[PDB]
C-alpha cells in the first residue's frame, strides 16, 4: 500500500553476539582469538513489525547492506518472521539466496529469481491447494545449489503462552563458505524495549560451500489476511553488523563459553 516511511530507532546491544570460533573442544582454558565479533555495548537497530495503522501494511523490510556479516535476532512470540533473501542487485539477473521454512524442509535454493516489490508470506496455510506463498518470485532461470533438510528452526510454541522465542542468528560469508549460528532460550518478561543481560553462545549449525557475492540483505514477513489487506501480530527483530575484533575467551569445565572479554 501507500504506507509512510518510519525512522529507525537504536538500542544498546549489551554483551551479546559471541560465537564458537572452531569445532575444537577446549576446557578451563582462557583462549584468545582474532575474528569478526560484535563489539560490546554497541548500537543495534530494534525494528518492530506489528499491525500498522490498525490494518495498514508496513513495509519495514529495507534492503540492508550485508557488508561483512549480521547479527539478526528476534524476540518473536509466534511464527511471523521468515526469509533471509540476499542479492547483489535483487533482480532476475543476479544469483540470490532464499531461506524458506516450508513445513519441515529448509529447501535451500541458489537460483536467479524475479522479486516482487513487496514480497510476503501467509502464516496461515492456504485452504485446498498447497499455498499461494510462492508469490515472492515467478521466474527461475538456471540453478546452482539445492539443499533440503530439517527446518532451520526447532522452536515450538504449541506448548502454551506466557513465553516467547529469542532467536539469534549470525550470517557470515567468507572464502566461499556460508556459516549459520543459532541459539534459542525462553524469556522471563515481555519487555520488547531492550535485550536482556545474559550470556549466550551461538553454535555453528549449517555450513555451505557456495561462492555467491553477497552485498544486501532482505527480510520476509508471514501474514495471511485480515485476521483490511494483509495483517498479522506483533514481532520485533534486530540487525547487528559484524566487524573484526580481538577477544579473550574463558571456557568452563564442559567446554561452554560462560563469559568473554
Amino acid at each position: 500500500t501507500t504506507r509512510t516511511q518510519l525512522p529507525p530507532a537504536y538500542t544498546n546491544s549489551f554483551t551479546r553476539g559471541v560465537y564458537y570460533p572452531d569445532k575444537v573442544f577446549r576446557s578451563s582454558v582462557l583462549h584468545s582469538t582474532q575474528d569478526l565479533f560484535l563489539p560490546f555495548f554497541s548500537n543495534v537497530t530494534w525494528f518492530h513489525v506489528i499491525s500498522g495503522t490498525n490494518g495498514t501494511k508496513r513495509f519495514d523490510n529495507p534492503v540492508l547492506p550485508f557488508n561483512d556479516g549480521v547479527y539478526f535476532a528476534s524476540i518473536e512470540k509466534s511464527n511471523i518472521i521468515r526469509g533471509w533473501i540476499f542479492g547483489t542487485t535483487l533482480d532476475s539477473k543476479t544469483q540470490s539466496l532464499l531461506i524458506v521454512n516450508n513445513a519441515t524442509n529448509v529447501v535451500i535454493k541458489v537460483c536467479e529469481f524475479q522479486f516482487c516489490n513487496d514480497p510476503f508470506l501467509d502464516h496461515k496455510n492456504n485452504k485446498s491447494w498447497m499455498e499461494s506463498e510462492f508469490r515472492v518470485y515467478s521466474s527461475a532461470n538456471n540453478c546452482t545449489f539445492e539443499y533440503v533438510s530439517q527446518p532451520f528452526l526447532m522452536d515450538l510454541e504449541g506448548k502454551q503462552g506466557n513465553f516467547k522465542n529469542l532467536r539469534e542468528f549470525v550470517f557470515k560469508n567468507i572464502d566461499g563458505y556460508f556459516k549459520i549460528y543459532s541459539k534459542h532460550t525462553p524469556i522471563i518478561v515481555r519487555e520488547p524495549e531492550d535485550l536482556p543481560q545474559g550470556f549466550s553462545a551461538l553454535e555453528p549449525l549449517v555450513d555451505l560451500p557456495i561462492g555467491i557475492n553477497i552485498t544486501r540483505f532482505q527480510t520476509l514477513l508471514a501474514l495471511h489476511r485480515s485476521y483490511s489487506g494483509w495483517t498479522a501480530g506483533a514481532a520485533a527483530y534486530y540487525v547487528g553488523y559484524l566487524q573484526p575484533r580481538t577477544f579473550l575467551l574463558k571456557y568452563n569445565e564442559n567446554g561452554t563459553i560462560t563469559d568473554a572479554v
Binding site: 573442544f25 577446549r26 576446557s27 578451563s28 582454558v29 553454535e203 567446554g255 561452554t256
Partner: protein, 97 residues
C-alpha cells in the same frame, strides 16, 4: 576406527599422532569434534562410529641414567629409569622398547 589400550599412530581427520586411546569422561557438545588442553595439544577426539569420545595420552617415555662405582674395582652397573612405573617397564620390555 577402533583398537584400545595401545599407543598407536592414527589419521583421525588427518591428525597423525601417537597416544593411548582410552575411555574418557568429557561431555563434548554435539557439534564439538576435537579436544585440547592448557598447552594447546590434542587431548580427546570424537568417535566417528559411536557417540562416546575417547582420551588421548601419549604412552610412556623417558630418559635413562647409569650409576657406576668407577670402572676401577668392578664393572657392575645399575640402571635407573626416571619417572616410570616399575610394572610398566619390567626387564622383558626389550621386545618393544
Amino acid at each position: 576406527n577402533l583398537v584400545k589400550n595401545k599407543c598407536v599412530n592414527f589419521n583421525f581427520n588427518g591428525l597423525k599422532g601417537t597416544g593411548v586411546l582410552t575411555e574418557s569422561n568429557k561431555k563434548f557438545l554435539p557439534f564439538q569434534q576435537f579436544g585440547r588442553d592448557i598447552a594447546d595439544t590434542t587431548d580427546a577426539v570424537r568417535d566417528p562410529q559411536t557417540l562416546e569420545i575417547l582420551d588421548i595420552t601419549p604412552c610412556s617415555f623417558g630418559g635413562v641414567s647409569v650409576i657406576t662405582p668407577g670402572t676401577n674395582t668392578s664393572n657392575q652397573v645399575a640402571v635407573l629409569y626416571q619417572g616410570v612405573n616399575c610394572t610398566e617397564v619390567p626387564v622383558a620390555i626389550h621386545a618393544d622398547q
